[PDB]
Amino acid sequence: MLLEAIFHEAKGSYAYPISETQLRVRLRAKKGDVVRCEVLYADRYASPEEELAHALAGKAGSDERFDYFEALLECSTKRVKYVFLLTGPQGEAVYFGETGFSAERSKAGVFQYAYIHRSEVFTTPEWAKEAVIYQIFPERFANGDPSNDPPGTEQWAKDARPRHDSFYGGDLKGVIDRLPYLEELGVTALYFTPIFASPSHHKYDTADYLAIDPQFGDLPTFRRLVDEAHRRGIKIILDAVFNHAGDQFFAFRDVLQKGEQSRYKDWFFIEDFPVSKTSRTNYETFAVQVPAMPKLRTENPEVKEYLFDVARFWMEQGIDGWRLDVANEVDHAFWREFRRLVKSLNPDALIVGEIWHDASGWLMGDQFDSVMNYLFRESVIRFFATGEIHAERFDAELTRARMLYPEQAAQGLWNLLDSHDTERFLTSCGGNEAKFRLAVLFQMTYLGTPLIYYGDEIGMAGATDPDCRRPMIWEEKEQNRGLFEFYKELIRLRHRLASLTRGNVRSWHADKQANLYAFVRTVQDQHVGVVLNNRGEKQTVLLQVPESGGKTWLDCLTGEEVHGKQGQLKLTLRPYQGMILWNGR
Numbered sequence: 001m002l003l004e005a006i007f008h009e010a011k012g013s014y015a016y017p018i019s020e021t022q023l024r025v026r027l028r029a030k031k032g033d034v035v036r037c038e039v040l041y042a043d044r045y046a047s048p049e050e051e052l053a054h055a056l057a058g059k060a061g062s063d064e065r066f067d068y069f070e071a072l073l074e075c076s077t078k079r080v081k082y083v084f085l086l087t088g089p090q091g092e093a094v095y096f097g098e099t100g101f102s103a104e105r106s107k108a109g110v111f112q113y114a115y116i117h118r119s120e121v122f123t124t125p126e127w128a129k130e131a132v133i134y135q136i137f138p139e140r141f142a143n144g145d146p147s148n149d150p151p152g153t154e155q156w157a158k159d160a161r162p163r164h165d166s167f168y169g170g171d172l173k174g175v176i177d178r179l180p181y182l183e184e185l186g187v188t189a190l191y192f193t194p195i196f197a198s199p200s201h202h203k204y205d206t207a208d209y210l211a212i213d214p215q216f217g218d219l220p221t222f223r224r225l226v227d228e229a230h231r232r233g234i235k236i237i238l239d240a241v242f243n244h245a246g247d248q249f250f251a252f253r254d255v256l257q258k259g260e261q262s263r264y265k266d267w268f269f270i271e272d273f274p275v276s277k278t279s280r281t282n283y284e285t286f287a288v289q290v291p292a293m294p295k296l297r298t299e300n301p302e303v304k305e306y307l308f309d310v311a312r313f314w315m316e317q318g319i320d321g322w323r324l325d326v327a328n329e330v331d332h333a334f335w336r337e338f339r340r341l342v343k344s345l346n347p348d349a350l351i352v353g354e355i356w357h358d359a360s361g362w363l364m365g366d367q368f369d370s371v372m373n374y375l376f377r378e379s380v381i382r383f384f385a386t387g388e389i390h391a392e393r394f395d396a397e398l399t400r401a402r403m404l405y406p407e408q409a410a411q412g413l414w415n416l417l418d419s420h421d422t423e424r425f426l427t428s429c430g431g432n433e434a435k436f437r438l439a440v441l442f443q444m445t446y447l448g449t450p451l452i453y454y455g456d457e458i459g460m461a462g463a464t465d466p467d468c469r470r471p472m473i474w475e476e477k478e479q480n481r482g483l484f485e486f487y488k489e490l491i492r493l494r495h496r497l498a499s500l501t502r503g504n505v506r507s508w509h510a511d512k513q514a515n516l517y518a519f520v521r522t523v524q525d526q527h528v529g530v531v532l533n534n535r536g537e538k539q540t541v542l543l544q545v546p547e548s549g550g551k552t553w554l555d556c557l558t559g560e561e562v563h564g565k566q567g568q569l570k571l572t573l574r575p576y577q578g579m580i581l582w583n584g585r
């Protein structure tokens, strides 16, 4: 077997604590090479004479190239050393440890997890495990207060096409007013795009961190909002824009005015004085040449103390946590201290970073609780929208992504389809509703936390920003109620079936040919099995279901009852149909 494909490291995603006395460990091997992975382990100081402990590692998944193996170590002493025993299909045995490979245990050496610290156990808020989140881009959700509408507000109609600088009048009073709609949908948290004083429709160039933007409301309206949402089981997440200020931020105005007399010059990244050249800015901005968005020097303890003060302020209004804009471009120390502070004020405050690539380095337990899982979105796109990948690549892409982080992270990754920075997911499906609903079914059943983007639930389309930000369709007639009852129904299932909010995932069937993908959520003895017929025609499948997992299932959407003769389940799906099979437990 291929030793060049064998991997483990006693840290990160490969070895990490689940409590104070148990370590999770993972090994990856060329797909097919190992058939048995066993951990032989002991206290770090055990005498060379005491017997090893055994823990046999099940295969938790496979991608394009690897199999992944997973085991739980029971470490009373909280200090472990161990070695893997791998066995190939012909019964070849090799010992894998820190020192290397060898047929002699001893010669493999031992990886070591020196010590489990209670404070180093990744722990996330419980409500997040089983939440569904709704993203509101306030400027375009609901105009409930016409008197606070910005100048030149265009008209709020069924098919306005917004320009980069448009205003439609959405505000906070409109959220308050639409809360029954939200509660009826079944959402349990709201993700607000930025809502602090800024002169733009997105408000990502902050004028004032400590004020509601006047055309969104005032602080009393916000408090009225937090409570009104809270009494309906809805939390409030706010968008913390800490990477950069807007060009009207007090300190930066100081800087434009006083040049290098400003007490605030080292709060920014000023290339030379006077600060301002437009089409050529002489200061570093978000992205490239974005004069409204000078980068904040978060490494500056003054800059840091100030944003910490912001975070406290809003947290005293009772919000429920943060979404961290361009988070991967502010330093790690900032984020570790931000967590120490945030968790200290509210152990249940959630923290979610806006990073699009491999966020493994902010998801070890000391920074973010979760991220907007744009990876999740990529696989979803290329599988149900564009169809670039078939069912077996999809499975690899899902799994490989699943193994990237500690479980505590993957349990509450924000799995979206689209956002305010993206074309709408119906649009990626070229308007094909049938493919869309399958992507929604998938989303509402897969591991992680579903994020809805205001509007998707009733049919809204659009190309990418600023077209993905149209005014929300509110006229019953103009809305896809069929799709709305669909989200509603899916959301209640998610709430009833613990398995869907808390169970794990294992691939159940994956056939590149039929393009029929299935997976299984399990918590305790509950098995829910989801099947996806992502094909234009109608097909049949024989799913391997052993007698142990139950032999009778109930299809949750239709009520249909299904039966397994002989370790097998025969199933006939309709074009783009999905089934959600509860094993009755």
Ligand SMILES: C[C@H]1O[C@H](O[C@H]2[C@H](O)[C@@H](O)[C@@H](O)O[C@@H]2CO)[C@H](O)[C@@H](O)[C@@H]1N[C@H]1C=C(CO)[C@@H](O[C@H]2O[C@H](CO)[C@@H](O[C@H]3O[C@H](CO)[C@@H](O)[C@H](O)[C@H]3O)[C@H](O)[C@H]2O)[C@H](O)[C@H]1O
Pocket: 164, 202, 204, 241, 286, 287, 290, 325, 326, 327, 354, 356, 357, 420, 421, 465, 466
């Ligand atoms: C949009 C996105 O760019 C990357 O995202 C890249 C990504 O790094 C890479 O992995 C690959 O996937 O492409 C992505 C392109 O979207 C970042 O890494 C990511 O963090 C960022 N998203 C957050 C940060 C900005 C600034 O606060 C916000 O935009 C906010 O300010 C911008 C300032 O002009 C506005 O866009 C404007 O400039 C952009 C830069 O190319 C244009 O794409 C856009 O069409 C234009 O309107 C935007 O409408 C407003 O909402 C945004 O809404 C918020 O979510």
Ligand SMILES: [Ca+2]
Pocket: 143, 144, 145, 146, 147, 148, 149, 150, 168, 169, 170, 171, 215
């Ligand atoms: Ca308004």
